[PDB]
């Protein structure tokens, strides 16, 4: 499904996806969906 408003996902150097919270200018390994 689509990420919540303000979020995106990218891949870290180690290849693991991380999620980016532009609403609070923070990131996390955990999927927010």
């Amino acid at each position: 499904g689509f990420l919540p408003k303000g979020w995106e996902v990218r891949h870290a150097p180690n290849g693991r996806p991380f999620f980016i919270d532009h609403n609070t200018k923070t990131t996390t390994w955990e999927d927010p969906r």
């Binding site: 990218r10 870290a12 150097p13 180690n14 693991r16 991380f18 980016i20 919270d21 200018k25 923070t26 990131t27 996390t28 390994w29």
Partner: peptide
């Protein structure tokens, strides 16, 4: 093994 911080985006 922490994620990249927001400054790295």
């Amino acid at each position: 093994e922490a994620p990249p911080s927001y400054a790295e985006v």
